[PDB]
Amino acid sequence: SSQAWQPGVAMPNLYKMQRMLLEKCDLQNYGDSATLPKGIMMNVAKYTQLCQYLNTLTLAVPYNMRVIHFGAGSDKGVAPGTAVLRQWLPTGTLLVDSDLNDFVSDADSTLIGDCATVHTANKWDLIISDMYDPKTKNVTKENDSKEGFFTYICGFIQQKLALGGSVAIKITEHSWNADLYKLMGHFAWWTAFVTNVNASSSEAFLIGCNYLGKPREQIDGYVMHANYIFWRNTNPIQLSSYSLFDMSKFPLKLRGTAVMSLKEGQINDMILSLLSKGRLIIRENNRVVISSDVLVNN
Amino acid sequence: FAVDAAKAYKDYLASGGQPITNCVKMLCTHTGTGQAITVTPEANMDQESFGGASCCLYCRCHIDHPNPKGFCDLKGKYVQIPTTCANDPVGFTLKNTVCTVCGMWKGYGCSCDQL
Numbered sequence A: 001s002s003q004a005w006q007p008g009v010a011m012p013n014l015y016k017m018q019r020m021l022l023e024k025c026d027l028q029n030y031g032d033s034a035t036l037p038k039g040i041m042m043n044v045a046k047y048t049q050l051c052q053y054l055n056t057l058t059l060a061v062p063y064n065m066r067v068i069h070f071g072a073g074s075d076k077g078v079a080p081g082t083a084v085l086r087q088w089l090p091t092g093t094l095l096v097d098s099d100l101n102d103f104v105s106d107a108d109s110t111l112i113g114d115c116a117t118v119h120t121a122n123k124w125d126l127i128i129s130d131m132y133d134p135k136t137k138n139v140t141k142e143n144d145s146k147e148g149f150f151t152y153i154c155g156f157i158q159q160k161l162a163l164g165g166s167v168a169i170k171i172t173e174h175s176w177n178a179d180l181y182k183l184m185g186h187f188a189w190w191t192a193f194v195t196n197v198n199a200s201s202s203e204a205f206l207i208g209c210n211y212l213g214k215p216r217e218q219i220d221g222y223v224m225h226a227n228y229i230f231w232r233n234t235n236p237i238q239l240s241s242y243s244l245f246d247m248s249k250f251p252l253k254l255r256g257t258a259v260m261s262l263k264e265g266q267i268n269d270m271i272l273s274l275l276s277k278g279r280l281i282i283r284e285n286n287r288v289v290i291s292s293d294v295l296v297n298n
Numbered sequence B: 001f002a003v004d005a006a007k008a009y010k011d012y013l014a015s016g017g018q019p020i021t022n023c024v025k026m027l028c029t030h031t032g033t034g035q036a037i038t039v040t041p042e043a044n045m046d047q048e049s050f051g052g053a054s055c056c057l058y059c060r061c062h063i064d065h066p067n068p069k070g071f072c073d074l075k076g077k078y079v080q081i082p083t084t085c086a087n088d089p090v091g092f093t094l095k096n097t098v099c100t101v102c103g104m105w106k107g108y109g110c111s112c113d114q115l
């Protein structure tokens, strides 16, 4: 297959249409590793292939684009994904990132603390989340839909994502949420994308492409996670670093997508059509103001 | 009194100490302008491009950037490092200076002192 030369593999549509039961995820390539280029961290390669895949979708890319990055820190104290996003997004793009623990970043602003404490006045054109809590991978207990930061994410998407904006939210076999799968039905398109560098993991990015603010199709999150696990169980993906060696077309093209501040009665079917095609962002174009709530105690 | 961390890191290195790790190296074509501090990776055949924040000693050590106003040259940018020095990008950025005429490192790309 050409798949080894792609940045990763996206869930095929026929799998999205099934009604599988949730099964334990057992990957044939489990334990294999991709040969990363010399000196390259796994998360730089992972974010790179994520952005290479995003280059194939109809993302709205306005002027003064607004991107927020949750789960941006690491145990290294640095933010590799934020650096890749910085490299990928057009110059002048506002990049805010956040994490629970402190880290040093290249983002324009960084908030430290639980994501539940993060509040912003404005809306966003692109949301990226790599938030993950290792305590969720418990093979000895039932794999229920998880809440925690996922709850925040769903709220944050419905209140603070611009119409036509896009999201990419990291999930695993156990780090997932049913309402997030349901929310994917409020986008013009959605997928689960697996990077070729990390194809031995149940990890994928839930990508919602072009937010519509209302359900387009009805998605059962439990069934859809079952479908994703069935896909990953039955389609071994070949680990590959190949796409990392061609960075010649990596930058996100600055499309100058129109931004309009419309009220809700104004969103006719033609506006919906423009949103669906990556040609319109609906949000106010004011100042970007963010904050992190601080709990005081003794 | 003022903590002088650049000096302490230079002496730490001279004492045979292990350089600061986890500087974030980027993927790039390595056909860039080779300038020192850029808004996107600009490594040439002879450089690696790193995220600036991870290569600044003050950012990495959680201490004040040494200037009034406290601004940081590297954070939010990308720093090109000669591949022969990529083992220690923080030490390199500390030990060297950028030409203000051409954007290149003095002694590592700058040729403004040529005939």
Ligand SMILES: C[S@@+](CC[C@H](N)C(=O)[O-])C[C@H]1O[C@@H](n2cnc3c(N)ncnc32)[C@H](O)[C@@H]1O
Binding pocket: A043, A071, A072, A073, A074, A075, A078, A079, A080, A081, A082, A098, A099, A100, A101, A113, A114, A115, A116, A130, A131, A132, A133, A148, A149
């Ligand atoms: C896989 S690491 C992300 C690594 C990072 N994206 C990188 O570039 O290397 C997952 C991160 O999510 C963060 N996290 C988990 N739960 C969180 C929460 N509820 N609020 C904020 N951050 C959270 C953890 O602190 C951890 O740093």
Ligand SMILES: [Zn+2]
Binding pocket: B053, B056, B057, B058, B059, B060, B065, B072, B073, B074, B075
């Ligand atoms: Zn700094």
Ligand SMILES: [Zn+2]
Binding pocket: B099, B100, B101, B102, B103, B104, B110, B111, B112, B113
């Ligand atoms: Zn010069």
